[PDB]
Amino acid sequence: MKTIFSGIQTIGNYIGALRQFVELQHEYNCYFCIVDQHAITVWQDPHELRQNIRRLAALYLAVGIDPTQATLFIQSEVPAHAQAAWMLQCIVYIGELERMTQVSAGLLTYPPLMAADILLYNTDIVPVGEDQKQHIELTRDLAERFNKRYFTIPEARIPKVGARIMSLVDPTKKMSKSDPNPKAYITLLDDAKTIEKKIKSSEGTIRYPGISNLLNIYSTLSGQSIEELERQYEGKGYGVFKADLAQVVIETLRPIQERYHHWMESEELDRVLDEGAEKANRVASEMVRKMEQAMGLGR
Amino acid sequence: MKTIFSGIQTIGNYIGALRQFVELQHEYNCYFCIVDQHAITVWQDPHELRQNIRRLAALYLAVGIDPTQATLFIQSEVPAHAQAAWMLQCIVYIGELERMTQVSAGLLTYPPLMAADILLYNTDIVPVGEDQKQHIELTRDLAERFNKRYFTIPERIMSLVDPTKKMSKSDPNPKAYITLLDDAKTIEKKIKSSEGTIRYPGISNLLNIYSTLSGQSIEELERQYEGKGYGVFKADLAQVVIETLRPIQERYHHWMESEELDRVLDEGAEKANRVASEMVRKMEQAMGLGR
Ligand SMILES: Nc1ncnc2c1ncn2[C@@H]1O[C@H](COP(=O)(O)O)[C@@H](O)[C@H]1O
Numbered sequence: 001m002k003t004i005f006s007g008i009q010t011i012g013n014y015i016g017a018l019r020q021f022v023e024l025q026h027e028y029n030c031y032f033c034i035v036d037q038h039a040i041t042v043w044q045d046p047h048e049l050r051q052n053i054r055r056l057a058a059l060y061l062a063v064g065i066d067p068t069q070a071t072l073f074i075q076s077e078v079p080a081h082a083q084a085a086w087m088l089q090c091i092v093y094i095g096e097l098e099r100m101t102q103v104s105a106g107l108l109t110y111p112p113l114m115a116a117d118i119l120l121y122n123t124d125i126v127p128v129g130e131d132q133k134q135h136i137e138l139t140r141d142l143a144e145r146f147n148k149r150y151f152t153i154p155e156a157r158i159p160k161v162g163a164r165i166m167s168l169v170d171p172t173k174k175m176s177k178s179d180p181n182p183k184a185y186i187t188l189l190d191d192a193k194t195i196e197k198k199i200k201s202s203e204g205t206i207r208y209p210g211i212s213n214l215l216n217i218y219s220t221l222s223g224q225s226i227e228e229l230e231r232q233y234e235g236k237g238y239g240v241f242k243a244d245l246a247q248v249v250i251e252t253l254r255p256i257q258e259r260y261h262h263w264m265e266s267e268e269l270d271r272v273l274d275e276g277a278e279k280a281n282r283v284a285s286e287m288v289r290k291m292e293q294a295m296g297l298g299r
Numbered sequence: 300m301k302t303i304f305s306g307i308q309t310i311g312n313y314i315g316a317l318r319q320f321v322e323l324q325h326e327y328n329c330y331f332c333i334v335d336q337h338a339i340t341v342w343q344d345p346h347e348l349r350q351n352i353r354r355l356a357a358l359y360l361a362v363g364i365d366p367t368q369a370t371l372f373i374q375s376e377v378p379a380h381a382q383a384a385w386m387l388q389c390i391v392y393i394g395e396l397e398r399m400t401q402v403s404a405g406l407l408t409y410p411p412l413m414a415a416d417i418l419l420y421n422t423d424i425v426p427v428g429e430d431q432k433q434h435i436e437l438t439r440d441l442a443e444r445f446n447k448r449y450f451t452i453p454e455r456i457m458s459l460v461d462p463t464k465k466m467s468k469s470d471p472n473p474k475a476y477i478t479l480l481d482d483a484k485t486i487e488k489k490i491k492s493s494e495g496t497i498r499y500p501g502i503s504n505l506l507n508i509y510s511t512l513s514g515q516s517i518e519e520l521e522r523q524y525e526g527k528g529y530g531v532f533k534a535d536l537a538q539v540v541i542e543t544l545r546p547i548q549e550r551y552h553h554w555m556e557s558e559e560l561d562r563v564l565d566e567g568a569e570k571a572n573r574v575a576s577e578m579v580r581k582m583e584q585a586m587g588l589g590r
Pocket residue numbers: 009012013015016017127128129131158163164165166174175176
């Protein structure tokens with residue numbers, strides 16, 4: 001089947017890409033890489049980083065990611081990423097790196113590492129937004145350059161398209177976990193009280209920026225059409241609508257949150273990660289060896 | 300003991316650094332790394348590179364490097380180098396890299412890899428010339444920066460065609476230097492190629508090569524060669540050069556057609572891979588990588 005690779009460092013992300021990944025793990029060969037080596041391109045607190053790595057893994061498992069169907073692993077645990085990244089750093093031009101839209105050198109040399117993350121597994125598709133367009137283009141250029149000289153040409157395509165969830169405080173802005181205003185987003189780990197507060201915070205009619213965003217969250221999470229909801233809330237106010245949407249969000253997160261705690265306090269977590277690295281290390285190790293063979297490294 | 304690390308990409312070379320290498324491996328923990336990963340920072344022909352890697356290893360063994368005393372290995376065969384190099388790339392500043400006096404990103408990001416080569420083995424000494432001074436300074440700065448935040452702080456044959464330059468395989472004239480693998484015919488031609496007395500820039504250089512290769516003093520060669528021409532000197536020196544490389548070349552060719560070579564290299568990587576592995580793991584632990 002086709003290979004999918006996702007490098008990971010809210011409800012809008014869940015809905016936007018993650019929630020469909022749980023169906024797609026059965027059709028496609030999915031790879032979920034916790035890019036801890038990319039994380040260190042900026043200041044990091046060792047304890048926090050280590051903790052965030054575990055949380056992310058648990059969250060992905062809690063959401064439905066099947067460790068037997070997909071490959072969930074930690075980047076640093078697969079040396080091939082660093083090995084391949086160096087080889088690619090030798091074929092990439094400084095100009096290409098400098099041109100990047102986005103002083104620690106990791107901030108400039110990380111693109112070749114991202115290309116290695118992808119190219120290492122002969123991935124066909126990469127579920128990324130427009131913010132990663134340039135990055136994907138560079139990895140495609142590097143793949144072509146290497147191929148012609150001595151990989152599958154990756155493609156940036158999120159396979160099952162969801163809604164674009166916007167911030168609760170700025171309806172024209174995409175909802176992001178890096179928002180200065182915590183009120184702008186809803187975390188997969190937020191508690192009932194927080195969800196309500198965040199959801200509760202001049203037309204007065206429920207028709208499809210602010211209201212429309214709420215409807216998208218409601219629709220995708222409830223399974224009801226935007227028209228269905230429009231009819232159901234006819235002549236109704238935002239209060240009840242918000243009180244309603246707040247309950248659906250909670251009902252969605254609660255099962256996820258409790259699975260997250262089991263994983264977080266279970267030994268299976270580390271066991272599952274050990275297997276992921278093994279599965280990944282196996283595919284990547286082979287690729288690195290072919291790369292070295294083509295370049296002339298070692299024996 | 301103290302740890303020594305030497306990353307490797309003429310007779311002047313042997314006499315310079317490598318001869319004494321044949322000696323210090325017994326009272327020092329020496330590491331001889333064939334930096335093939337650094338080699339790819341510039342265009343390379345896969346077949347040539349692969350071949351050059353083998354040759355270099357054989358040459359180092361043929362010269363006297365004891366695989367049981369020192370650690371001879373190929374850089375790429377130890378993933379820790381690339382792993383540690385990335386972590387160091389994250390603590391180094393672009394400005395520091397740009398400031399380097401020495402185009403793939405690799406020409407600019409290779410210094411952090413060289414620092415990893417060194418720091419990985421807690422080396423105390425690095426046998427390098429002034430051309431690597433800046434590089435050594437950067438690895439010392441990186442070691443200090445990492446330590447404070449979260450390593451060991453590490454620290455003449457002229458040309459034949461130009462007695463004022465220096466003898467160097469990088470010469471466009473192959474007749475300005477002598478290769479350890481050069482044959483008798485070549486050695487003679489290169490050695491044979493107005494004041495007309497012998498004592499001690501061309502003559503002083505010849506006397507130096509003669510002295511260090513023969514074992515006799517420069518004065519010994521001076522009283523020895525009282526009232527002689529350059530003909531007979533050049534013929535004598537050229538013989539000593541052949542007598543020096545002969546045994547070496549014989550050992551070299553032996554290694555180049557034996558399976559013990561790959562056996563020795565496998566062992567080097569495994570002794571190197573074990574130690575570098577431990578360091579990488581401590582680095583990751585300090586930075587918060589993985590688990
Ligand atoms: N608010 C959102 N709505 C829809 N998709 C989102 C949202 N936030 C993130 N994503 C998707 O989830 C991933 C976010 O990756 P990142 O660039 O680190 O934010 C990409 O696949 C995005 O397209």
